[PDB]
Amino acid sequence: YWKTEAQATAYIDGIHKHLRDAAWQHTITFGELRGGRFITGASSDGMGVSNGDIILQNFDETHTGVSKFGDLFGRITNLNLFIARVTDATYLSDEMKNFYLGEVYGLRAFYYFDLYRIYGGVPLRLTLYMARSTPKEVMTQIKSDLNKSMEYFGNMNDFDPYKRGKKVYWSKAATECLMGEVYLWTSKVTTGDDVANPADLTIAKTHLESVLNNYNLKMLDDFSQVFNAKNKANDEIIFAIRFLEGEATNSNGTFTYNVGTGSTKNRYQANGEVFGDALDIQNTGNQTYEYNKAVYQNFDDADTRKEATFIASYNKDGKTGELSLYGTHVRKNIGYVNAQGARVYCGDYIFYRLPWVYLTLAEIANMEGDNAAVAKYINLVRKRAYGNAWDETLYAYPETADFTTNELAILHEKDKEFIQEGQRWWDLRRMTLTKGGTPLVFCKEGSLLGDAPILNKSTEAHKLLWPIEKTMLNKDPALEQTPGYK
């Protein structure tokens, strides 16, 4: 139905902006909230927090977290349409056609992999009132799409071949990262009829090592520079969602405080000074998402990620003047203050960056038994974190044959490295207490405090997957409820 290069390229831009619009759901709703480290009730700043049912694992046919399969099928159908229209188009160069098709097959895998991890089986729309396909059928499609993505990208490793925006359009590296994520997952996790297959580890490994070796990627010396809105598309980043002042901004202000009406402003900073507007966010913020303060307290003070990620607010004892930790507030990726003095939340949403590749390879190493490589990759990330304070004697991970110690060390490094970057729920589903053993979501060792499992395996096994709404079930008789829910 199209006649020109301009139209195809416009549609590619549109595909990316719709992907931007799903970034909060991908990273925060799906990746973070069920991770066992958010508070509920009133935040430190005084406001009832959002999504409390997701956070509490309260899931059933009237508490579904998101509606309409996360509203992703509209996006998917635009990908299908692009593929149908462009596959035999004669108005694009072979190079641009193949680059675009690489992107669009990659992104169709991306969306379906979120749907598989959240729901298991879902309708397979590739070309309403369609039945859910089985998890195996969905994963077959995901993997077919990833292979087609690589086939189209071929040898084009360039991140920015048309100079439209480096690292903010999908790329060959991004597909390789996704393959690393997908094949590791299927190596370790059974969902319905899609049975864990250790043969997949080798494929994950090859693609992640390719990412390390073939794209000129490098970890930055300064953790904060990774996220800095004035240092975007830097050498550590593989693929990020672009937020741009005057076009689209994100909701990272909701992890802060409300200067207008909240209580944080009247508490204190670590130095004893009144908190006020310590982040320079004016009245742009609220505190409707907040990490349990143990997340902050888990960092050593010599770990630069601590104050890069968080600012703390304190109560001061009326008698003794002693400060006690009260709330924490996320300043990891809150953009900048513009020339007019307004806070703009245009921090990019990074989906893949290099330390993720390292900790993912660490997890593969743990599966192999390559204890030396587990330690290597953990220490690469730690050494960067501690900066000029790095001291192997205090902070280095010593190698060990104990699978559990290694798996937990990798989780706890991801827990520190990837605050607000959408990993922990996935890590809890995927990582296991022992080789071939119980998912960490069912073990007290996976919880923030170490005291009780996030899910009870004997009563809550069905809550690994998310339910769909009663109203949708009533309107669409093709659909069945996610397994095990009433």
Q: Got the DSSP string for 89-151?
A: -SSS-HHHHHHHHHHHHHHHHHHHHHHHHHHSS---------PPPPHHHHHHHHHHHHHHHHH
Read off the tokens for 185: 């997952």
The single-letter DSSP state of residue 244 is B
Read off the tokens for 333: 């990726």
Half-sphere CA count of 164, side-chain side, radius 13 A: 17
Rg over alpha carbons for the chain, rounded to the nearest Å, is 22
Helix 135-153 vs helix 94-119: crossing angle, to nearest 10: 160
The 10 Å CB-count burial string (b at 16+, else e) for 132-171 is bbbbbbbbebbbebbebbbebbeeeeebeeeeebebbbbb
User: 332 to each of 47, 120, 476, how far by Cα in Å?
Assistant: 21, 32, 42
The beta strand positions in 11-119, using DSSP E, are: none
Determine which helix (DSSP H) or strand (DSSP E) holds 337, and give its type and residue range.
strand 336-337
The single-letter DSSP state of residue 407 is H
Q: How far apart are CA 23 and CA 20, in angstroms?
A: 5
Helices (H) then strands (E): counts for the chain: 17, 6
Q: Is 237 exposed, middle or buried, given 0-12, 13-18 or 19+ CB atoms closer than 10 A?
A: buried
Q: What CA dihedral angle connects 126, 127, 129 and 135, to 10 degrees?
A: -10
Helix 94-119 vs helix 172-188: crossing angle, to nearest 10: 30
Q: How far apart are CA 478 and CA 357, in angstroms?
A: 39
Assess contact for 83 and 101: CB atoms under 8 A.
yes
Q: Under 8 Å CB-to-CB from 214, ≥6 apart: which residues?
A: 157
Spatial CA neighbour of 411 closest among 439, 437, 370, 371: 439
- Domain range for residue 227? 1-486
How many distinct structural domains can be found in the chain? 1
User: 433 to each of 47, 184, 360, 415, how far by Cα in Å?
Assistant: 36, 16, 16, 16
User: 269 to each of 110, 218, 239, how far by Cα in Å?
Assistant: 41, 35, 35
Half-sphere CA count of 433, side-chain side, radius 13 A: 13
Q: How far apart are CA 249 and CA 482, in angstroms?
A: 34
Assess contact for 191 and 426: CB atoms under 8 A.
no
The owner of tokens 């004697």 is 393
* Phi, psi torsion values for 31, nearest 5 degrees: -85, -35
Resolution (A): 1.9
Read off the tokens for 127: 């070309």
Assess contact for 220 and 381: CB atoms under 8 A.
no
Assess contact for 255 and 2: CB atoms under 8 A.
no
CB atoms within 10 A of CB 390: 17
Beta bridge partners of 328: 312
User: 180 to each of 186, 211, 267, how far by Cα in Å?
Assistant: 10, 9, 45
At 23, which CATH number? 1.25.40.390
Q: Is the Cα torsion angle 470, 476, 478, 479 positive or negative in sign? A: negative
Spatial CA neighbour of 208 closest among 182, 190, 229: 182
Give the pairing of strands 336-337 and 349-353: unpaired
Give the pairing of strands 310-316 and 323-330: antiparallel
CB atoms within 10 A of CB 250: 21
Q: Under 8 Å CB-to-CB from 117, ≥6 apart: which residues?
A: 30, 185, 426, 429
Collapse the DSSP code of 266 into the 3-class scheme (helix H, G, I; strand E, B; otherwise coil) and give the result.
helix
Method of determination is X-ray
Beta bridge partners of 432: 439
The owner of tokens 């009832």 is 48
Q: Is the Cα torsion angle 11, 17, 21, 22 positive or negative in sign? A: positive
